[PDB]
């Protein structure tokens, strides 16, 4: 708690989207973005990161899923916080399953550190998921993954990875290096990289339209 921001389905939800915001934010802005592309049968859940000290910014307390120590290829990542946060997301997936939405009808996603967390959670959980929408982010703890395919429940998971070509905070190059790594961890036929010309560390309407088409293709209406 506080309770996640929820976009209810218009009718009993047969699928769900769990979207994780980035550093400094809450789930409200992203909930309004998903409300503008909402499908009648999908529930959208945007949980709020706890407020915690961020090492990168002199331990200033701000909403963050885990600690951030640096932005360069050699920078250390918060292994314990990332794993802890991923088990918390797995518990939210579990709640949705027990409450009637199978995990193969759930898409996980996020922006920046939230996107990184969504990839890490999807690529470690054995709860089969429908897909991932990874926006302006990177694969965290990349060296801990195998050198080949991950195997397991989510070996054929569909992933939409989005990036702004003018991102001044998460270089396009880290988005590209991440998708090249995702194409070796899972079936590459279901991994798609979309880039938005002129977009910085932000979102845009064309990206939300591509996210909507991906969500609708993977979580179509069912009888
Ligand atoms: O935490 C990190 C660590 N970063 C190391 C460098 N890296 C890779 O070399 C790479 C290539 C493929 C996968 O990883 C990405 C991760 N970064 C980050 C955080 C923020 C924000 F959280 F503070 F906002 C912003 C921007 C950045 Cl880059
Ligand atoms: Cl419902
Ligand atoms: Cl972030
Ligand atoms: Cl349906």
Curated annotation (Swiss-Prot):
The modification N6-acetyllysine is found at residue 217. GO terms for cellular component: cytoplasm; cytosol; endoplasmic reticulum; extracellular exosome; mitochondrion; nuclear membrane; nucleoplasm; plasma membrane. It comes from the Eukaryota. Transmembrane segments: none annotated. Inhibited by palmostatin-B, leading to impair depalmitoylating of Ras. It is found in: Cytoplasm; Cell membrane; Nucleus membrane; Endoplasmic reticulum. GO terms for molecular function: carboxylic ester hydrolase activity; lipase activity; lysophospholipase activity; palmitoyl-(protein) hydrolase activity; phospholipase activity. It catalyses: S-hexadecanoyl-L-cysteinyl-[protein] + H2O = L-cysteinyl-[protein] + hexadecanoate + H(+); 1-hexadecanoyl-sn-glycero-3-phosphocholine + H2O = sn-glycerol 3-phosphocholine + hexadecanoate + H(+); a 1-(9Z-octadecenoyl)-2-acyl-sn-glycero-3-phosphocholine + H2O = a 2-acyl-sn-glycero-3-phosphocholine + (9Z)-octadecenoate + H(+). It holds the Pfam family Abhydrolase_2. Acts as an acyl-protein thioesterase. Hydrolyzes fatty acids from S-acylated cysteine residues in proteins such as trimeric G alpha proteins or HRAS. Acts as a palmitoyl thioesterase that catalyzes depalmitoylation of proteins, such as ADRB2, KCNMA1 and SQSTM1. Acts as a negative regulator of autophagy by mediating palmitoylation of SQSTM1, decreasing affinity between SQSTM1 and ATG8 proteins and recruitment of ubiquitinated cargo proteins to autophagosomes. Acts as a lysophospholipase and hydrolyzes lysophosphatidylcholine (lyso-PC). Homodimer. This is Acyl-protein thioesterase 1.
